[PDB]
Design a protein around this ligand. Structure first.
Ligand SMILES: CCCCCCCCCO[C@@H]1O[C@H](CO)[C@@H](O)[C@H](O)[C@H]1O
Ligand SMILES: CCCCCCCCCO[C@@H]1O[C@H](CO)[C@@H](O)[C@H](O)[C@H]1O
Ligand SMILES: CCCCCCCCCO[C@@H]1O[C@H](CO)[C@@H](O)[C@H](O)[C@H]1O
Ligand SMILES: Cc1ncc(Cc2csc(C=O)c2C)c(N)n1
Length: 178
């Protein structure tokens, strides 16, 4: 019914995030453009918070069980491959249920959710990845740069794609019965 439709959409966007995560996205070392965020963001914005959290969760789990996650420790895996991708669901708080679709909430929702995801990577960068800190850099400054810049680039890409979607396919962002 409504729920079968909702569950299928969650599953498809999680599998799509995963499939897109296979596209090489490295800019320089762990500075990356995470375009794989976008189907979770779209899902969160169309179907709301809970749907998005769960899509994030399923994507994280696929990353791990398929071997495509970089795992250093249990707690680090939990932080970066469960919490971080789930955290994209916060975009669901900016869902629009009624037309016309406004651009500003799409962009606010995306910004806040990518920010929150890369805030957890930033925290992880400090805790788990400091042995890789560039010559002359403190851990915090190194994680801030790497994850600050990845966050920004990820949001740029998420904005380019979702802006195109808002202008050419606005109904993607408004769930409709019927
Ligand atoms: C499924 C819900 C949450 C549980 C997540 C389970 C995924 C655990 C996967 O572990 C990792 O798998 C890699 C190869 O599979 C190994 O190379 C790696 O050493 C190991 O750490
Ligand atoms: C609720 C589950 C959260 C995700 C599950 C994570 C399981 C992956 C655990 O990987 C292993 O953890 C050890 C540290 O404890 C590392 O020494 C080891 O290298 C690593 O391979
Ligand atoms: C030192 C040679 C390596 C490159 C030199 C320029 C980049 C060095 C990073 O500077 C950063 O500036 C902050 C205060 O200035 C510190 O809090 C931070 O820990 C530090 O890492
Ligand atoms: C310095 C630093 N290097 C690597 C990672 C790990 C990482 C960055 S983005 C991302 C998306 O999955 C992961 C696993 C980190 N947090 N900080």
């Amino acid at each position: 019914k409504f729920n079968v439709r909702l569950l299928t959409e969650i599953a498809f966007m999680a599998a799509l995030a995963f499939i897109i995560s296979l596209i090489p996205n490295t800019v320089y070392g762990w500075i990356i453009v995470e375009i794989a965020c976008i189907p979770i963001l779209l899902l969160s914005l169309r179907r709301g918070l809970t749907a998005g959290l769960v899509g994030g969760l399923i994507w994280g789990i696929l990353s791990m069980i398929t071997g495509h996650a970089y795992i250093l420790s249990l707690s680090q895996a939990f932080l970066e491959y469960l919490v971080a991708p789930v955290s994209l669901g916060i975009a669901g708080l900016f869902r629009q249920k009624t037309a016309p679709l406004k651009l500003a909430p799409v962009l606010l929702g995306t910004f806040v959710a990518v920010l929150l995801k890369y805030f957890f990577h930033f925290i992880a960068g400090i805790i788990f990845w400091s042995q890789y800190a560039w010559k002359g850099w403190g851990a915090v400054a190194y994680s801030l740069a790497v994850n600050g810049i990845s966050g920004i680039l990820t949001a740029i890409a998420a904005f380019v794609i979702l802006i195109i979607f808002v202008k050419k396919f606005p109904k993607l962002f408004i769930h409709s019965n019927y």
